[PDB]
Amino acid sequence: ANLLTSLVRAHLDSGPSTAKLDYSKFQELVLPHFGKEDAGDVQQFYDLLSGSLEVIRKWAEKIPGFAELSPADQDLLLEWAFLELFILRLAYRSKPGEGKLIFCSGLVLHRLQCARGFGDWIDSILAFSRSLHSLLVDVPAFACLSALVLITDRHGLQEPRRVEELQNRIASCLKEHVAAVAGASCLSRLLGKLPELRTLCTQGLQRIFYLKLEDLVPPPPIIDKIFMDTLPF
Amino acid sequence: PANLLTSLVRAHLDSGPSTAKLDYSKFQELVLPHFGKEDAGDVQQFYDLLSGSLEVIRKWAEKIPGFAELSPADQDLLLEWAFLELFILRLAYRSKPGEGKLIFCSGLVLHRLQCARGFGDWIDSILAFSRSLHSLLVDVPAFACLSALVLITDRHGLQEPRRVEELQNRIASCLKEHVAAVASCLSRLLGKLPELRTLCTQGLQRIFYLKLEDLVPPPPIIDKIFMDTLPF
């Protein structure tokens, strides 16, 4: 399974091992003033989004065939999938049974430590984490499903058939994996969680809208561009 | 020289429904049933209720002495930037939060449950503000001044900001004197204005969400106020 192996490898290299989990800012209990934020909460919010986008862009460059799509198409796919991938990956790696968010750099933060920057959104992502975890999606299936989040039709693709071919290829790889484990239907079960995920993408845009309104610190330009480019209207 | 106070009271009273003219024909305490998500009729109603205050507030403003002596561009700017705030403040003062009753400027009366789907959490925030405002027991003349102060205020991009400031001055003086005639109370009334700006923000959040959802688009005038008033 050579595409599968490459996908797994790209996934594992885009995230921290248990070895490299960074507890240096983690606090088991903080006492926040809920419903408000300060500049450092907002900057950290954006820094975490920024750091994830860089990691995702490197992950994507490892999905065989992706780096040969047009540069515009690469950028388009990445922007339209970014928040969904940030959420899905964060949920898959976090430990909601401990209130722990684990970000792609290895940084661990307690839910209470994310409350001011993220608002309600982080408590919602942790709920989806529990929902996702109860499906018991294995790493290779996740490696495929995450790639399929990114490699998908989008309005404005220059070469939509080449994206569709790559989507076909990954979906076949996934099908062959789930057969091999079995020795198509949990799929239905997993797709049942998609509305929760979509709602979460929306909530992310809602949070960024609010923070832009408030403007304690501006979003970094690359995030701001994703926000603006993905607003239908 | 109030006179100004009387003119402000008059503009306020002429801009809202007579108790005689309240319409309860659509009012229902009970709704069948709520869970879950907003549908197209909830969203159309949201925008219809907002759009109902447009003309009314514009005509009110034109009766504030001195407002029609600001530049036409400054008039339009003031009205756009204050619109949500005035809608909220006027709705909060007119309504009966103890009963969950919203009274709109057309006279239409709706229960909070009939609004909640379209408005979201914002309607509860508005009703919390309404209960707070009611506890202040703001009299009509004080309210006539307060509302005017919401409109006649510094905004970015005014052509004649000092003339805005003079008229605001005049109105604030009028209010201060009125309150003396009938400082702790004044600062308390005036402390409602920042709360009102927070509620305007929650309104912009609601419209942003609805525009994202796109079941029914905002009407052009509301869409314009929304886009024009994003300071980014």
PDB file of C-alpha atoms in Angstrom, chain A residues 3-221:
ATOM      1  CA  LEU A   3       0.018   5.734  -1.250  1.00  0.00           C
ATOM      2  CA  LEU A   4      -1.262   4.608   2.166  1.00  0.00           C
ATOM      3  CA  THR A   5       2.201   4.523   3.582  1.00  0.00           C
ATOM      4  CA  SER A   6       2.982   7.927   2.283  1.00  0.00           C
ATOM      5  CA  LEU A   7      -0.243   9.355   3.726  1.00  0.00           C
ATOM      6  CA  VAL A   8       0.447   7.812   7.101  1.00  0.00           C
ATOM      7  CA  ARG A   9       3.929   9.135   7.089  1.00  0.00           C
ATOM      8  CA  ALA A  10       2.768  12.619   6.154  1.00  0.00           C
ATOM      9  CA  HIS A  11       0.228  12.536   8.971  1.00  0.00           C
ATOM     10  CA  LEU A  12       2.601  11.309  11.702  1.00  0.00           C
ATOM     11  CA  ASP A  13       5.310  13.761  10.768  1.00  0.00           C
ATOM     12  CA  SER A  14       2.856  16.695  10.969  1.00  0.00           C
ATOM     13  CA  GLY A  15       2.108  16.233  14.626  1.00  0.00           C
ATOM     14  CA  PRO A  16       3.909  15.728  17.932  1.00  0.00           C
ATOM     15  CA  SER A  17       4.796  12.327  19.350  1.00  0.00           C
ATOM     16  CA  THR A  18       4.195  11.715  23.000  1.00  0.00           C
ATOM     17  CA  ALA A  19       7.891  12.256  23.312  1.00  0.00           C
ATOM     18  CA  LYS A  20       7.756  15.808  22.196  1.00  0.00           C
ATOM     19  CA  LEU A  21       4.551  17.008  24.062  1.00  0.00           C
ATOM     20  CA  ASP A  22       5.306  20.426  25.515  1.00  0.00           C
ATOM     21  CA  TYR A  23       3.835  20.968  28.994  1.00  0.00           C
ATOM     22  CA  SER A  24       5.793  24.190  29.511  1.00  0.00           C
ATOM     23  CA  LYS A  25       2.725  26.486  29.482  1.00  0.00           C
ATOM     24  CA  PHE A  26       0.157  23.978  30.695  1.00  0.00           C
ATOM     25  CA  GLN A  27      -1.772  24.801  33.803  1.00  0.00           C
ATOM     26  CA  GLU A  28      -4.247  22.456  35.409  1.00  0.00           C
ATOM     27  CA  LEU A  29      -6.308  25.251  36.792  1.00  0.00           C
ATOM     28  CA  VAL A  30      -6.451  28.859  35.752  1.00  0.00           C
ATOM     29  CA  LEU A  31      -9.195  31.303  36.824  1.00  0.00           C
ATOM     30  CA  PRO A  32     -10.207  33.256  33.770  1.00  0.00           C
ATOM     31  CA  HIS A  33     -12.575  36.139  33.450  1.00  0.00           C
ATOM     32  CA  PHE A  34     -14.954  34.379  30.994  1.00  0.00           C
ATOM     33  CA  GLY A  35     -16.498  36.310  28.050  1.00  0.00           C
ATOM     34  CA  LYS A  36     -13.590  38.670  27.596  1.00  0.00           C
ATOM     35  CA  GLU A  37     -10.020  38.572  26.368  1.00  0.00           C
ATOM     36  CA  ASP A  38      -6.875  40.604  26.292  1.00  0.00           C
ATOM     37  CA  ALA A  39      -4.203  41.140  23.697  1.00  0.00           C
ATOM     38  CA  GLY A  40      -2.099  38.185  24.742  1.00  0.00           C
ATOM     39  CA  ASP A  41      -5.080  35.806  24.579  1.00  0.00           C
ATOM     40  CA  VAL A  42      -5.877  37.066  21.052  1.00  0.00           C
ATOM     41  CA  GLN A  43      -2.293  36.914  19.806  1.00  0.00           C
ATOM     42  CA  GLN A  44      -1.964  33.351  21.081  1.00  0.00           C
ATOM     43  CA  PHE A  45      -5.215  32.454  19.321  1.00  0.00           C
ATOM     44  CA  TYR A  46      -3.775  33.693  16.099  1.00  0.00           C
ATOM     45  CA  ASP A  47      -0.353  32.214  16.679  1.00  0.00           C
ATOM     46  CA  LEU A  48      -1.915  28.808  17.143  1.00  0.00           C
ATOM     47  CA  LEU A  49      -3.920  29.199  13.940  1.00  0.00           C
ATOM     48  CA  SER A  50      -0.807  30.431  12.117  1.00  0.00           C
ATOM     49  CA  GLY A  51       1.327  27.591  13.388  1.00  0.00           C
ATOM     50  CA  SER A  52      -1.246  25.046  12.304  1.00  0.00           C
ATOM     51  CA  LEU A  53      -1.533  26.453   8.786  1.00  0.00           C
ATOM     52  CA  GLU A  54       2.261  26.109   8.344  1.00  0.00           C
ATOM     53  CA  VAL A  55       2.199  22.556   9.493  1.00  0.00           C
ATOM     54  CA  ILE A  56      -0.764  21.723   7.332  1.00  0.00           C
ATOM     55  CA  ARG A  57       0.917  23.269   4.295  1.00  0.00           C
ATOM     56  CA  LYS A  58       3.943  21.029   4.912  1.00  0.00           C
ATOM     57  CA  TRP A  59       1.705  18.004   5.427  1.00  0.00           C
ATOM     58  CA  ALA A  60      -0.147  18.736   2.209  1.00  0.00           C
ATOM     59  CA  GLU A  61       3.181  18.968   0.256  1.00  0.00           C
ATOM     60  CA  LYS A  62       3.743  15.345   1.244  1.00  0.00           C
ATOM     61  CA  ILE A  63       0.510  14.014  -0.168  1.00  0.00           C
ATOM     62  CA  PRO A  64       1.664  12.434  -3.399  1.00  0.00           C
ATOM     63  CA  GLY A  65       0.377  14.425  -6.331  1.00  0.00           C
ATOM     64  CA  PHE A  66      -0.477  17.535  -4.367  1.00  0.00           C
ATOM     65  CA  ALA A  67       2.727  19.449  -4.988  1.00  0.00           C
ATOM     66  CA  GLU A  68       2.259  19.061  -8.693  1.00  0.00           C
ATOM     67  CA  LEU A  69      -1.126  20.734  -8.792  1.00  0.00           C
ATOM     68  CA  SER A  70      -1.023  24.370  -9.887  1.00  0.00           C
ATOM     69  CA  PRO A  71       0.164  26.770  -7.288  1.00  0.00           C
ATOM     70  CA  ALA A  72      -3.116  28.506  -7.398  1.00  0.00           C
ATOM     71  CA  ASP A  73      -5.012  25.214  -6.900  1.00  0.00           C
ATOM     72  CA  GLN A  74      -2.761  24.249  -4.015  1.00  0.00           C
ATOM     73  CA  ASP A  75      -3.479  27.568  -2.328  1.00  0.00           C
ATOM     74  CA  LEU A  76      -7.188  27.372  -2.959  1.00  0.00           C
ATOM     75  CA  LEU A  77      -7.503  23.860  -1.513  1.00  0.00           C
ATOM     76  CA  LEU A  78      -5.517  24.775   1.498  1.00  0.00           C
ATOM     77  CA  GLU A  79      -7.468  27.902   2.289  1.00  0.00           C
ATOM     78  CA  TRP A  80     -10.895  26.336   1.903  1.00  0.00           C
ATOM     79  CA  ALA A  81      -9.872  23.310   4.004  1.00  0.00           C
ATOM     80  CA  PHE A  82      -7.789  25.064   6.626  1.00  0.00           C
ATOM     81  CA  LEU A  83     -10.227  25.598   9.471  1.00  0.00           C
ATOM     82  CA  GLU A  84     -11.773  22.165   8.975  1.00  0.00           C
ATOM     83  CA  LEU A  85      -8.405  20.534   9.135  1.00  0.00           C
ATOM     84  CA  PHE A  86      -7.306  22.587  12.132  1.00  0.00           C
ATOM     85  CA  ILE A  87     -10.429  21.448  13.966  1.00  0.00           C
ATOM     86  CA  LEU A  88     -10.363  17.826  12.823  1.00  0.00           C
ATOM     87  CA  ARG A  89      -6.673  17.338  13.633  1.00  0.00           C
ATOM     88  CA  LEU A  90      -6.956  19.146  16.950  1.00  0.00           C
ATOM     89  CA  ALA A  91      -9.942  17.052  17.923  1.00  0.00           C
ATOM     90  CA  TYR A  92      -8.249  13.803  16.883  1.00  0.00           C
ATOM     91  CA  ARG A  93      -5.213  14.540  18.952  1.00  0.00           C
ATOM     92  CA  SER A  94      -6.667  16.172  22.040  1.00  0.00           C
ATOM     93  CA  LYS A  95      -7.690  14.447  25.334  1.00  0.00           C
ATOM     94  CA  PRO A  96     -11.106  15.648  26.222  1.00  0.00           C
ATOM     95  CA  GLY A  97     -11.315  13.298  29.170  1.00  0.00           C
ATOM     96  CA  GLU A  98      -8.666  15.579  30.785  1.00  0.00           C
ATOM     97  CA  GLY A  99      -9.722  18.878  29.311  1.00  0.00           C
ATOM     98  CA  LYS A 100      -6.494  18.926  27.351  1.00  0.00           C
ATOM     99  CA  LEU A 101      -6.054  20.557  23.922  1.00  0.00           C
ATOM    100  CA  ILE A 102      -2.940  19.333  22.145  1.00  0.00           C
ATOM    101  CA  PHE A 103      -1.812  21.523  19.265  1.00  0.00           C
ATOM    102  CA  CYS A 104       0.391  20.543  16.339  1.00  0.00           C
ATOM    103  CA  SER A 105       3.599  21.931  17.887  1.00  0.00           C
ATOM    104  CA  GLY A 106       3.117  19.659  20.909  1.00  0.00           C
ATOM    105  CA  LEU A 107       1.905  22.493  23.057  1.00  0.00           C
ATOM    106  CA  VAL A 108      -0.613  21.339  25.633  1.00  0.00           C
ATOM    107  CA  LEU A 109      -3.163  23.789  27.070  1.00  0.00           C
ATOM    108  CA  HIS A 110      -6.050  23.201  29.401  1.00  0.00           C
ATOM    109  CA  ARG A 111      -9.552  24.102  28.218  1.00  0.00           C
ATOM    110  CA  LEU A 112      -9.603  26.944  30.811  1.00  0.00           C
ATOM    111  CA  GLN A 113      -6.453  28.342  29.314  1.00  0.00           C
ATOM    112  CA  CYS A 114      -8.056  28.493  25.848  1.00  0.00           C
ATOM    113  CA  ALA A 115     -11.370  29.910  26.974  1.00  0.00           C
ATOM    114  CA  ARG A 116     -10.493  33.581  26.682  1.00  0.00           C
ATOM    115  CA  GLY A 117      -8.862  33.463  23.248  1.00  0.00           C
ATOM    116  CA  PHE A 118     -11.141  30.879  21.634  1.00  0.00           C
ATOM    117  CA  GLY A 119     -14.485  31.634  23.372  1.00  0.00           C
ATOM    118  CA  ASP A 120     -17.066  28.774  23.312  1.00  0.00           C
ATOM    119  CA  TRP A 121     -15.467  27.392  20.205  1.00  0.00           C
ATOM    120  CA  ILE A 122     -12.843  25.421  22.103  1.00  0.00           C
ATOM    121  CA  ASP A 123     -15.421  23.783  24.389  1.00  0.00           C
ATOM    122  CA  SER A 124     -17.290  22.796  21.170  1.00  0.00           C
ATOM    123  CA  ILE A 125     -14.126  21.387  19.600  1.00  0.00           C
ATOM    124  CA  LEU A 126     -13.546  19.277  22.686  1.00  0.00           C
ATOM    125  CA  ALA A 127     -17.131  17.922  22.414  1.00  0.00           C
ATOM    126  CA  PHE A 128     -16.404  16.961  18.796  1.00  0.00           C
ATOM    127  CA  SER A 129     -13.150  15.365  20.019  1.00  0.00           C
ATOM    128  CA  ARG A 130     -15.246  13.054  22.196  1.00  0.00           C
ATOM    129  CA  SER A 131     -17.602  12.419  19.328  1.00  0.00           C
ATOM    130  CA  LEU A 132     -14.703  11.563  16.949  1.00  0.00           C
ATOM    131  CA  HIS A 133     -12.885   9.473  19.477  1.00  0.00           C
ATOM    132  CA  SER A 134     -16.022   7.275  20.089  1.00  0.00           C
ATOM    133  CA  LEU A 135     -15.758   6.221  16.373  1.00  0.00           C
ATOM    134  CA  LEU A 136     -12.305   4.785  17.005  1.00  0.00           C
ATOM    135  CA  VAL A 137     -10.848   5.899  13.668  1.00  0.00           C
ATOM    136  CA  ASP A 138      -7.437   4.311  13.200  1.00  0.00           C
ATOM    137  CA  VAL A 139      -4.415   6.283  12.054  1.00  0.00           C
ATOM    138  CA  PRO A 140      -4.309   5.106   8.448  1.00  0.00           C
ATOM    139  CA  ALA A 141      -8.040   5.773   7.982  1.00  0.00           C
ATOM    140  CA  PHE A 142      -7.531   9.230   9.515  1.00  0.00           C
ATOM    141  CA  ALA A 143      -4.528   9.874   7.287  1.00  0.00           C
ATOM    142  CA  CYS A 144      -6.764   9.217   4.332  1.00  0.00           C
ATOM    143  CA  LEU A 145      -9.868  11.040   5.602  1.00  0.00           C
ATOM    144  CA  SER A 146      -7.902  14.185   6.446  1.00  0.00           C
ATOM    145  CA  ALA A 147      -6.349  14.158   2.982  1.00  0.00           C
ATOM    146  CA  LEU A 148      -9.824  13.859   1.472  1.00  0.00           C
ATOM    147  CA  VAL A 149     -10.913  16.920   3.447  1.00  0.00           C
ATOM    148  CA  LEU A 150      -8.304  18.862   1.540  1.00  0.00           C
ATOM    149  CA  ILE A 151      -8.427  17.136  -1.919  1.00  0.00           C
ATOM    150  CA  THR A 152     -11.947  17.914  -2.968  1.00  0.00           C
ATOM    151  CA  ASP A 153     -13.930  19.938  -5.437  1.00  0.00           C
ATOM    152  CA  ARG A 154     -13.871  23.742  -4.948  1.00  0.00           C
ATOM    153  CA  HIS A 155     -15.302  26.574  -7.033  1.00  0.00           C
ATOM    154  CA  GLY A 156     -12.397  28.281  -8.832  1.00  0.00           C
ATOM    155  CA  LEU A 157     -10.063  25.319  -9.277  1.00  0.00           C
ATOM    156  CA  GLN A 158      -8.050  25.591 -12.522  1.00  0.00           C
ATOM    157  CA  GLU A 159      -7.756  21.775 -12.824  1.00  0.00           C
ATOM    158  CA  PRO A 160     -10.712  20.243 -11.081  1.00  0.00           C
ATOM    159  CA  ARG A 161     -10.336  16.927 -12.906  1.00  0.00           C
ATOM    160  CA  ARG A 162      -6.797  16.476 -11.593  1.00  0.00           C
ATOM    161  CA  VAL A 163      -8.138  17.099  -8.064  1.00  0.00           C
ATOM    162  CA  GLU A 164     -10.962  14.658  -8.632  1.00  0.00           C
ATOM    163  CA  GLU A 165      -8.461  12.026  -9.861  1.00  0.00           C
ATOM    164  CA  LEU A 166      -6.396  12.440  -6.720  1.00  0.00           C
ATOM    165  CA  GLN A 167      -9.623  12.277  -4.647  1.00  0.00           C
ATOM    166  CA  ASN A 168     -10.493   9.006  -6.476  1.00  0.00           C
ATOM    167  CA  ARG A 169      -7.016   7.640  -5.681  1.00  0.00           C
ATOM    168  CA  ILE A 170      -7.231   8.428  -2.003  1.00  0.00           C
ATOM    169  CA  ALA A 171     -10.736   7.108  -1.614  1.00  0.00           C
ATOM    170  CA  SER A 172      -9.577   3.774  -3.209  1.00  0.00           C
ATOM    171  CA  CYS A 173      -6.605   3.666  -0.831  1.00  0.00           C
ATOM    172  CA  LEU A 174      -8.958   4.185   2.106  1.00  0.00           C
ATOM    173  CA  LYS A 175     -11.397   1.544   0.848  1.00  0.00           C
ATOM    174  CA  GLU A 176      -8.546  -1.002   0.564  1.00  0.00           C
ATOM    175  CA  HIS A 177      -7.409  -0.116   4.105  1.00  0.00           C
ATOM    176  CA  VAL A 178     -10.805  -0.554   5.746  1.00  0.00           C
ATOM    177  CA  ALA A 179     -11.222  -3.934   3.925  1.00  0.00           C
ATOM    178  CA  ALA A 180      -7.812  -5.049   5.174  1.00  0.00           C
ATOM    179  CA  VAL A 181      -8.727  -4.240   8.736  1.00  0.00           C
ATOM    180  CA  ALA A 182     -12.134  -5.836   8.320  1.00  0.00           C
ATOM    181  CA  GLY A 183     -10.661  -8.868   6.530  1.00  0.00           C
ATOM    182  CA  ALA A 184     -18.059   1.883   3.224  1.00  0.00           C
ATOM    183  CA  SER A 185     -20.297   1.711   6.499  1.00  0.00           C
ATOM    184  CA  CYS A 186     -18.629   3.071   9.705  1.00  0.00           C
ATOM    185  CA  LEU A 187     -18.139   5.607   6.962  1.00  0.00           C
ATOM    186  CA  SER A 188     -21.802   6.288   7.124  1.00  0.00           C
ATOM    187  CA  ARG A 189     -21.377   6.552  10.896  1.00  0.00           C
ATOM    188  CA  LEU A 190     -18.492   8.939  10.578  1.00  0.00           C
ATOM    189  CA  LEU A 191     -20.267  11.042   7.973  1.00  0.00           C
ATOM    190  CA  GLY A 192     -23.046  11.400  10.546  1.00  0.00           C
ATOM    191  CA  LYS A 193     -20.629  13.600  12.554  1.00  0.00           C
ATOM    192  CA  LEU A 194     -19.963  15.924   9.643  1.00  0.00           C
ATOM    193  CA  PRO A 195     -22.736  18.408  10.558  1.00  0.00           C
ATOM    194  CA  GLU A 196     -21.096  18.909  13.970  1.00  0.00           C
ATOM    195  CA  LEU A 197     -17.786  19.562  12.153  1.00  0.00           C
ATOM    196  CA  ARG A 198     -19.346  22.025   9.732  1.00  0.00           C
ATOM    197  CA  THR A 199     -20.947  23.864  12.537  1.00  0.00           C
ATOM    198  CA  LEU A 200     -17.474  24.070  14.047  1.00  0.00           C
ATOM    199  CA  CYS A 201     -16.004  25.589  10.907  1.00  0.00           C
ATOM    200  CA  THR A 202     -18.681  28.217  11.040  1.00  0.00           C
ATOM    201  CA  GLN A 203     -18.010  28.888  14.687  1.00  0.00           C
ATOM    202  CA  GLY A 204     -14.338  29.445  13.857  1.00  0.00           C
ATOM    203  CA  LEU A 205     -15.248  32.100  11.276  1.00  0.00           C
ATOM    204  CA  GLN A 206     -17.670  33.609  13.838  1.00  0.00           C
ATOM    205  CA  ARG A 207     -14.848  33.829  16.384  1.00  0.00           C
ATOM    206  CA  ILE A 208     -12.476  35.425  13.956  1.00  0.00           C
ATOM    207  CA  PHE A 209     -15.199  37.903  12.933  1.00  0.00           C
ATOM    208  CA  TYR A 210     -15.678  38.894  16.527  1.00  0.00           C
ATOM    209  CA  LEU A 211     -12.033  39.244  17.197  1.00  0.00           C
ATOM    210  CA  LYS A 212     -11.606  41.358  14.067  1.00  0.00           C
ATOM    211  CA  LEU A 213     -14.432  43.593  15.238  1.00  0.00           C
ATOM    212  CA  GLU A 214     -12.811  43.972  18.557  1.00  0.00           C
ATOM    213  CA  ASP A 215      -9.329  44.260  17.001  1.00  0.00           C
ATOM    214  CA  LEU A 216      -7.130  44.068  20.098  1.00  0.00           C
ATOM    215  CA  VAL A 217      -4.482  42.800  17.689  1.00  0.00           C
ATOM    216  CA  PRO A 218      -5.032  42.312  14.010  1.00  0.00           C
ATOM    217  CA  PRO A 219      -5.127  38.851  12.488  1.00  0.00           C
ATOM    218  CA  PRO A 220      -1.935  37.921  10.733  1.00  0.00           C
ATOM    219  CA  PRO A 221      -2.275  38.562   6.991  1.00  0.00           C
TER     220      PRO A 221
END
